[PDB]
Each structure stands twice: as structure tokens, then as C-alpha cells.
Amino acid sequence: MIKLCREVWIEVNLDAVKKNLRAIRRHIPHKSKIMAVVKANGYGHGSIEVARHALEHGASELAVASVEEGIVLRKAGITAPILVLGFTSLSCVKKSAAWNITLSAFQVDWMKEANEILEKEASANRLAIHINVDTGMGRLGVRTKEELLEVVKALKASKFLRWTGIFTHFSTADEPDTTLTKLQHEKFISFLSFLKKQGIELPTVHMCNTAAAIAFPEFSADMIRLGIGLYGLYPSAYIKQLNLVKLEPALSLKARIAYVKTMRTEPRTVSYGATYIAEPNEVIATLPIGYADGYSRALSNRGFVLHRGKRVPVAGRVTMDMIMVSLGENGEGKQGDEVVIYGKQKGAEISVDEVAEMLNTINYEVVSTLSRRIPRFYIRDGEIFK
Amino acid sequence: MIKLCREVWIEVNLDAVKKNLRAIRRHIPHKSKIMAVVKANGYGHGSIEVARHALEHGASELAVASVEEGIVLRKAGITAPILVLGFTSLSCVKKSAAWNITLSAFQVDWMKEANEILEKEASANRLAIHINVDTGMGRLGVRTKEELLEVVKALKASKFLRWTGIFTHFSTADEPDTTLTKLQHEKFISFLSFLKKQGIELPTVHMCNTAAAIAFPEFSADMIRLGIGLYGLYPSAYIKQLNLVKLEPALSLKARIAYVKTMRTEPRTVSYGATYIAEPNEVIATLPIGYADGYSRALSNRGFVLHRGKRVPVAGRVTMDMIMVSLGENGEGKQGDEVVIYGKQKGAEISVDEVAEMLNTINYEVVSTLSRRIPRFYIRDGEIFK
Numbered sequence A, B: 001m002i003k004l005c006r007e008v009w010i011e012v013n014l015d016a017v018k019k020n021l022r023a024i025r026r027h028i029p030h031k032s033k034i035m036a037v038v039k040a041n042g043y044g045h046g047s048i049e050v051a052r053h054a055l056e057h058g059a060s061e062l063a064v065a066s067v068e069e070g071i072v073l074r075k076a077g078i079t080a081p082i083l084v085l086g087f088t089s090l091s092c093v094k095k096s097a098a099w100n101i102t103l104s105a106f107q108v109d110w111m112k113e114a115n116e117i118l119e120k121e122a123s124a125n126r127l128a129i130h131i132n133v134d135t136g137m138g139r140l141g142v143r144t145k146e147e148l149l150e151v152v153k154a155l156k157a158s159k160f161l162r163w164t165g166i167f168t169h170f171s172t173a174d175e176p177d178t179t180l181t182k183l184q185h186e187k188f189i190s191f192l193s194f195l196k197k198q199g200i201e202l203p204t205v206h207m208c209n210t211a212a213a214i215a216f217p218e219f220s221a222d223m224i225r226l227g228i229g230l231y232g233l234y235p236s237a238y239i240k241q242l243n244l245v246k247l248e249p250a251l252s253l254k255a256r257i258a259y260v261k262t263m264r265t266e267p268r269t270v271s272y273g274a275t276y277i278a279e280p281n282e283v284i285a286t287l288p289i290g291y292a293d294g295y296s297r298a299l300s301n302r303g304f305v306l307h308r309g310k311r312v313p314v315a316g317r318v319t320m321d322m323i324m325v326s327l328g329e330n331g332e333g334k335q336g337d338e339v340v341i342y343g344k345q346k347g348a349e350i351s352v353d354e355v356a357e358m359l360n361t362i363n364y365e366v367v368s369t370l371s372r373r374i375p376r377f378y379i380r381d382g383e384i385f386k
Ligand SMILES: Cc1ncc(COP(=O)(O)O)cc1O
Pocket: A037, A085, A169, A208, A209, A210, A211, A225, A226, A227, A228, A229, A235
């Protein structure tokens, strides 16, 4: 059994990750590759071991949010293509080329300036580039086919740069009204047709996130970007209710009870603000998770955890490192008992989706804000490591 | 100037931290020591550099949430006493003795088994222990006089343990109604006097958090635990509005504009869900921070950042690594312009307190959830460093 000083931990089930990759692979066209999106520490699951597992079981490439995230993966021994999805300052072009990290860009000046930097440095490696086309997300990317053509030309004239992809991002592919997604797809294809009409040969074309991969597998083109689905989580209730691909949640969050007491003497106030008053025979268990771990303070007097297969409520306010839960009057519980904060236990389950609904957010935020001070353990072929 | 691949960073002003320590020192009794509370990675400020600066300018001990947080400080060369405030499993008794970490405990069985472990190791040093007395927080600690005495007798009879402190925690000392705080203090004093009437000499007595140190400096006893106030933030608006101690916020959160564009062509949808539609001459700036950094998704269509001394609004949904803000109709701004997310710029300010109120939470949570993938820079004697 697990030995920790502070007994809170994450379990990432890599067998589920493999099953999730397999389900997406079996759904999308055979020719389409899979780019596993492991930005933000693998959506809080741990980027290194999720990326390693994905590449063993179906993925060809990786996506991250920054050069620094890509370098962490290279230092783990990973040789697969790694795309930075956001903006990379020209200050890191030299470093990105040396680590064989692929950068997104979409402006003539950036292309020309990056080339000149690598020229001046006598760079040993060329820098791989994907062009972002903004078709309605409004975040990053080139927005007109005229300007796109100039960006392509600047990239092609840059001998120290290497064009390896072109992509766009859907902003509402997880919604019931598909109008905007079809307009974006139509616009993207129009831009790509414009380039081909100029005789330009296209590199790897990718546009689908998890939502469009499930709902519009025919848009998979050369490659899709599998993010939330890799982790066994759906991009929206609507996509889940399509019932087209079966995903298995990979992440659980657990702890062991640090202390158990009956509230026999007064005062029976519990936690900050004294917002909860226990009964004289009520049993209160203290757990080593709090809002600095990413367990939202808005779950104060609201959240649930699983103990011995049953939902027991948070009592009083969440504190920075600890919560208290009620085991009820003369409730049964002991120090050391395992508690499930997100996940399954015996018959019961408190899913990340249910926590997100309670907090009026999305599963993406619940998992990707799990603090790095929580250790992560990995299950593969039914057994733990790391 | 700072050189980053992904241009988001934190600045922690250690001159402000020094001034905060002095203000608290100047307010509490001369004989009272300060234990600087640096749990949760220094409330998101960086535990190592804040601890180092505090021990140099008025603090003599440290508090953390876990043995693991104390080990981080020891590895950085910090030799001051470090108290673990939460529960430490018996499997970490030997390691805490080797690292000279002080643990909190409050149960006869824990004392006896911990001593038994060390006795079997023939440990060359006694493990330092503080006893937690639960006077109303209801989280950890012993709750009756008679069980406190049994716990003290077991600790004193454990030759491989060393009693070096006794404490309690106030649960409503930041609130206008002081009734519960006065009851907690009365009870703690009563328990300590009961121990003295048994012939027991007390070690270091501490009970004040920031709130009680400010509002009840007469409770400071041998030592206070300075947390939120060390970082220049008040435990509550009520405590701040007492106007008794001037604190200066230490943390700012900043970024540089990744891209600026005019929404000339259709569609003018911004970010996921297309919840924002820009005007044809509206300027949208994209910034490299998102909810995986700790910038709450609940600030979608609600938050503000500072650009050229002006508040500009978040436009559309917060995404995992990026947000978009509107510089207005015909707005002026350039890629690479510095933006302040939390903090001051020219005459403007977006305090952590204001962000917390928008989100129905507290400043503690806003800072302590700042992701470790944001690099932290420290200002000391008016100049930046590592
Ligand atoms: C540009 C980009 N592309 C793809 C993803 C993955 O999306 P999902 O998690 O919804 O699958 C994220 C992203 O920022």
C-alpha cells in the first residue's frame, strides 16, 4: 500500500487511457493520425507518462502549450513530434530548433524574424512550423486567404524554417447547433483550396478537437488533436449523449482519513467561520485535501466524498490544506480509511463531471487545476508505479 | 527585461514582504516571536524565497502543511525550525527526525508508536513535537483537559520525542463578532493553566493567525503564526478596515500580449461557445494565461486586466492557456505590450482582493492556486532576480 507523509494522491489509470485512444482510433478514418494533447501537465494527469503511453498505443504526435512543456517531454526521452499550440516569443526560436520542438505561427514578420535569428546563430537544426488559420475561434491565427498566402510564401522562402502542418480550431463543435462549426469547416477548406489553386502542396492538415472527432469524424483530414477524450472525459454533455464513442475516466483523486472524532464536548463548531455545528454524537473526519490542492473552496458545506461506498458531506468551510466531512451520528470510520474525492468506490462514484456541474464549470478545469504538490501514481496492466 | 517562451510570470516583491514583517513585529509584543507560514508553496508566492527573506527580517521559525513541504525548504539550505501543521503519518516519523522537521500531534497512541519507531532505530536525535489543542476549529487537536494531560504525559515519557510547542487555531478571529474568539482564548488559557497546576512547564505557546495578531496582539504569547499578512494581504475586510497595521501586497501577475488584431472579417466570434461577438473595428488582444494557470474560468466575460493603465475586459470564455481581452473600438495596443493581471499599473490596480470578491471566495485561494508552471521572479532592494 502507498506510503505518504501527507496522505492525498492521484491515480491515473493508463489502461483506461489506452482504451480511450483505441475508441477514438476505431471511430475516425483509418488514414488519420492522432496528436495527443498533453498541455497543462497532461490536463493535470501528468504529461510525461500520459504522452509515453499514448505514443505506445496509437498516437503519432503530441501537443503542448509552450516550449517549456515540450522540453520536459524531450528530457523524458520522447522523440515524437511536439507542437506548441500557443504563441512562442522569438526569444525561444533558437532553443525550440535545438530541441526539435514544432512551433505554431501565423504572421509574415514572425516567420522572417525567426529565420534571421536562426541564420545569425548558424543553427544546426531547422525549425518546424505549423500555420494556425483562425476561422472563428478568434484567439490566434491568420484570418484572410490573402494574408495566409503571404504567410506561406514567407515560410517557404525561409530556409531555416520547415512547414510541417496547417490547422484551425473549432469553437462550438461540442454544441447541438452545428451552424458555426460547418461555416468554420467550409472556410478552412476554402482557404486550403485557395493555396492549392496557387500550386502550393499542403502539409499535414488538422482541425478536429475531441468534440469534432466524435461528432464530425469526416473532418479528421490528416490528423486530429485528441485532448479531453484521451483522459476519458467528454467535451460536453451533448457529445456524451450522442453515444458514439465509449470513454473511460482515467483520473481518480484519493486520500486517507487523518483523524476521526465524536463532537462530544462544546463548542461543536467546525472549520472557519463556524458555519457548521455538529451534534453531540456526530462523527467528524478530517481529510488532507484543501483549496490549494485545487479542491474548490466553493465546495464548502456542499461537496461530497466517498467513504466505505457512501457519499459523506463536507462539513463547514474548505481550508487551504484540509477539509472535514461528517460520518453522521455514531458513524463508522477510522484514521487511515481510504476516501475517494473524485472517482469510484464500491458501488458509488463522484465524477469530475458532477463536481464541475456543482461548481458551474467544466471537467477540463477540474482536472487541469489539480496542484502539482499532489503526487501522481500510474496504473498499467492493473498495477501501480511512479 | 524578462525573456520567456510563454510570456506570463509572477513578480514577488520581497521589499514588501520585509515591510509586512516589520509592521507586524512593530504591532505585537516585543518578546513574541514570528513563525512565518509558507505552506502551499508560500501561498503561491514560492515557499523557498519567501521563507529565506522572512527568516532574515523578523521571523525565526516556519510552518508548512506537510513533511514534503518542509523537505523542499531544507534542500534549499534553510535550517530554521519548521513545523508541520497538519497530520503526519507514522510512516514518516524516521524521515522527519533525519530532516530535523517538527511535527504536530495530539494523540497518546501516535506519541507512543512514533517513539517506538525511533527507539528501534536508536535515533541520534529526538523528534520535535508540537501539541495541537482543538478549542473550536474542530479540524485537528485534542479537545479536553484530561486527554491533553494524557497526551502530554505520553510525550514526556517518550524519550525519543521532544515537546517544543503547544498551540490552537482560532476559527473566527477575522470577524466583527468576537464572542467565539474570546471563548477559544479563554478555553486555551484554561487548559494551559490546568497543565501548570499539574506541575508541567510549558514550551512555546502560540495561538494567533494574522487576524488575531492584528486584532488581539495581547494573545501573541510566545509566538504568532503570520500567514496571509506576510504576503501583504488581510484575512478579512473587517480586519483591514480596523486600520491598525499597514500591509503592502507582495504579488503581481503579469503577461505580454501575444497577438493583437482588428476583427475586420466575419465571423467575429471570440473563444469557445462564441459567447462574444466583436465589432468590425474592435481590437482583440490575446494573452498567454488561462484557467490551467489558476485564472478562474468563472472570469469568462467578467474579468479585467490592466493595459496602459486602463482596465480592459475579458472577452468570451477563458480557455485553458489563453484569454482574449477587448481593447475597444479602434483600440491601441501592440504585440509584446505588458499587461497586469493582478496588481498595479500606472494609477490603476486589480487587487487579488477584488478578484476574490468577484469569484465569491477569499484572497487566500486566489494566490495559493497560482500554478507552478508560471515562473516566479523576486524583487529585492528594488531589483529583480531568480
Ligand atoms: C488548439 C487546440 N487544439 C486542440 C485541443 C484539444 O481539444 P479538446 O480537449 O476539446 O479535445 C486544444 C487546443 O487548445
